[PDB]
Amino acid sequence: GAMAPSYRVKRMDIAKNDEECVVNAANPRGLPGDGVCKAVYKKWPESFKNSATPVGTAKTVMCGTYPVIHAVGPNFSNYTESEGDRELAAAYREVAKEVTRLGVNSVAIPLLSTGVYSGGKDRLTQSLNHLFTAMDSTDADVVIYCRDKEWEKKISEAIQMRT
Ligand SMILES: [Cl-]
Ligand SMILES: [Cl-]
Ligand SMILES: [Cl-]
């Protein structure tokens, strides 16, 4: 465990993380994809061997000894708001189980279903609150990665609110 388990946010490429493992915002088929998934494919392509897994699940594949946790959020273009919310919550619960099983002291994590799976909606709060629900009972240092300056400020404020 971390000595004083924390949440932090950084506005940078998750492929350049400084944590002991990474969560990929994966597609169900283990394809290179776009956005976070394509950056992860370029950095850790060996981790895409048999990485296909259903929506609402996470599957870890090693790149050398570096764990890549493939977490499959729902595409809100295809799911109802209700079913999509349930699968997004479930994907983060499966990430918490994998982080625990691996025994890592830190994890790099993107906000699932906030990009091309967002169905065109701002899901910062929705996705972050499900991340907290899952990861609060873990003792890994969690470092959340984003690309937008306004998102960085809002994620930082949400972390500070609970402090
Ligand atoms: Cl960067
Ligand atoms: Cl996404
Ligand atoms: Cl972002």
Side-chain angles (χ1 to χ4, degrees), residues 112-118:
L112 302 179
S113 296
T114 63
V116 303
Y117 280 11
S118 73

Side-chain angles (χ1 to χ4, degrees), residues 13-126:
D13 189 354
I14 198 171
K16 304 183 184 187
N17 77 75
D18 191 32
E19 287 70 61
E20 291 187 353
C21 71
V22 69
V23 174
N24 183 26
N27 56 75
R29 304 177 181 275
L31 294 162
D34 308 80
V36 162
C37 189
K38 173 35 83 69
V40 168
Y41 182 72
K42 284 187 177 131
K43 181 58 61 174
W44 304 283
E46 299 92 339
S47 69
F48 290 70
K49 191 163 179 279
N50 290 309
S51 68
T53 196
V55 171
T57 78
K59 183 170 198 185
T60 304
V61 183
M62 306 310 297
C63 177
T65 71
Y66 188 80
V68 179
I69 303 168
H70 299 275
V72 183
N75 182 2
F76 277 98
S77 290
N78 296 333
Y79 283 91
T80 62
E81 285 293 335
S82 171
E83 204 74 354
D85 183 73
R86 193 183 58 67
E87 288 298 4
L88 178 55
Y92 280 118
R93 293 188 302 271
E94 299 300 306
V95 165
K97 299 177 184 171
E98 286 296 282
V99 166
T100 299
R101 181 180 67 75
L102 287 165
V104 294
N105 293 335
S106 62
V107 55
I109 192 159
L111 295 186
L112 302 179
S113 296
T114 63
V116 303
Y117 280 11
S118 73
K121 296 194 180 159
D122 173 350
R123 290 193 188 274
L124 191 170
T125 296
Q126 175 179 25

